[PDB]
């Protein structure tokens, strides 16, 4: 009605639209980064509801196969592998690379190469 | 009315607060997500000033060594000083196998082998 009420409605409109663009801009670049990490590293990294990290391989044999890592603390860099149905199947890779070598990148690299070799044409 | 003016001023503050928060939690979450992707995969994924993806390995032997990938569904590796040092890996895994993940995985394992102590 009044010009003062109008001006305030246009400010509410303006803010609720900043919203709509921050979401959509935070929406593409997040996916851009994740789909890029997928295409490059071969791992689809999701953040679970418990703020842990679920990894699915580009060369996974079954769609539900995944690994879950958790960060021990925000103020640290250590991470730990949690038990999944699929991690049950790679105990040898875990022993060699996670336990004896203590290198998650070496573990996921060795797992990627192993899964790649298993995914034959026929 | 002063009634509506007061209610709207509060709405503007509320709307601005919702946007301000969206900024702070995004900042914390992706830096958490970025640190997690780096610790897990062993690669620092930076989106460069040309919408390109430059990657740095946790086991990079010399500061400045990097790989740059250009985006278009398929992604092309561009020329860098470090690209030339691994021509052998590029031939086996990027062209024969047509797999960037197999390429970067083989690179990480090779870099990790030469990074070891004693």
């Amino acid at each position: 009605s009044s010009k003062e009420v109008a001006e305030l409605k246009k400010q509410v409109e303006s803010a609720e639209l900043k919203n709509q663009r921050l979401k959509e801009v935070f929406q593409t670049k997040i996916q851009e980064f994740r789909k890029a990490c997928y295409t490059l590293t071969g791992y689809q990294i999701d953040i679970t509801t418990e703020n842990q990290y679920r990894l699915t391989s580009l060369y996974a044999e079954h769609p539900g196969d995944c690994l879950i890592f958790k960060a021990t603390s925000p103020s640290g860099s250590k991470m730990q592998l949690l038990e999944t149905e699929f991690s049950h199947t790679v105990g040898e890779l875990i022993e060699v690379h996670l336990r004896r070598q203590d290198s998650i990148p070496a573990f996921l690299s060795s797992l990627t190469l192993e899964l790649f070799s298993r995914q034959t044409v026929a | 009315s002063s009634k509506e003016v007061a209610e709207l001023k509060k709405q503007v503050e509320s709307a601005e607060l919702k946007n301000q928060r969206l900024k702070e939690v995004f900042q914390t979450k992706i830096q958490e997500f970025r640190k997690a992707c780096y610790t897990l995969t062993g690669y620092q994924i930076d989106i460069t000033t040309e919408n390109q993806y430059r990657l740095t390995s946790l086991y990079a032997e010399h500061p400045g060594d990097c790989l740059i990938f250009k985006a278009t569904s398929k992604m092309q590796l561009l020329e860098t000083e470090f690209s030339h040092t691994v021509g052998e890996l590029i031939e086996v895994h990027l062209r024969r196998q047509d797999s960037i993940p197999a390429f970067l995985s083989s690179l990480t394992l090779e870099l990790f082998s030469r990074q070891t102590v004693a």
Binding site: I30, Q31, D46 | L22
Partner: peptide
């Protein structure tokens, strides 16, 4: 466990949904 303010929870509810696929 002070509780997050409604503006911090709402933003975290959508930002974390975008990290899940």
């Amino acid at each position: 466990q002070p509780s997050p303010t409604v503006h911090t929870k709402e933003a975290l509810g959508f930002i974390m949904n975008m990290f899940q696929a």
